Ligand binder design. Structure first.
Ligand SMILES: CCCCCCCCCCCCCCCCC[C@@H](O)O[C@H](CO[C@H](O)CCCCCCCCCCCCCCC)COP(=O)(O)OCC[N+](C)(C)C
Ligand SMILES: CCCCCCCC/C=C\CCCCCCCC(=O)O[C@H](COC(=O)CCCCCCC/C=C/CCCCCCCC)COP(=O)(O)OCCN
Lengths: 83, 70
């Protein structure tokens, strides 16, 4: 393990730019897989309405589809406001 | 003695020739039939052969398209 420490110390001298660039690139590759907020970003992208929500034809068997926007049914965006 | 030791009766050759003639006549009939069937399928296209590909219908998206008139 000592050779790695010597190599990193040697590279931090006389080549700091390459060390910094490789560190930043490696962190950019690794970190997104660990952040808990990437799912939040995906959800925020989901929640953005670019298109008209086409209503469904009521057949008496959709208890979970609301009849009005004010109805409690359907997805809520309270988590986004809390963010 | 020559006939007994080296050769066989006429019936063997006779019946073998009958069998050979049957086989090869069937083969000729099958060849003509194959040519006719190939011509018919290539002209019509209603058989298993000469089936050229078309666009799959499972690729089409059946969903509202931001505009009522598609
Ligand atoms: C006084 C005698 C006058 C007549 C002399 C006749 C001598 C005959 C010699 C020439 C014969 C030529 C061969 C003709 C036929 C050979 C090929 C084939 O037709 O015969 C095969 C058989 O061949 C024989 O088994 C072997 C023939 C070999 C002859 C060799 C003669 C010369 C050899 C010389 C050797 C010298 C010694 C070595 C010195 C170093 C297959 O017969 P097979 O399918 O079963 O028959 C079944 C018949 N059934 C169905 C009715 C039962
Ligand atoms: C998976 C991550 C990838 C993304 C990160 C990188 C993004 C962009 C950076 C890469 C660009 C291309 C790099 C090209 C490398 C060339 C190396 C080379 O041969 O140059 C050597 C110099 O460099 C070397 O000696 C070879 C590599 C030296 C170190 C390289 C980085 C080592 C690891 C760095 C990161 C370590 C981990 C970070 C820990 C930091 C501590 C917190 C010669 O120097 P010259 O300029 O030609 O001569 C002029 C002087 N007379």
């Amino acid at each position: 393990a000592g050779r790695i420490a010597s190599f990193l110390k040697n590279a931090w001298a006389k080549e700091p730019v390459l060390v910094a660039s490789f560190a930043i690139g490696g962190l950019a590759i690794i970190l997104p897989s660990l952040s808990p907020y990437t799912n939040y970003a995906i959800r925020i992208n989901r929640a953005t309405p670019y298109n008209y929500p086409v209503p469904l034809r009521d057949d008496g068997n959709m208890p979970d589809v609301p009849s009005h926007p004010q109805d409690p049914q359907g997805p809520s965006l309270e988590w986004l406001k809390n963010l | 003695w020559i006939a007994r030791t080296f050769y066989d009766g006429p019936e063997k050759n006779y019946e073998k020739t009958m069998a050979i003639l049957q086989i090869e006549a069937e083969k000729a009939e099958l060849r003509l039939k194959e040519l006719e069937v190939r011509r018919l399928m290539r002209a019509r296209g209603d058989g298993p052969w000469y089936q050229y590909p078309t666009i799959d219908k499972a690729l089409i998206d059946h969903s509202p398209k931001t505009t009522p008139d598609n």
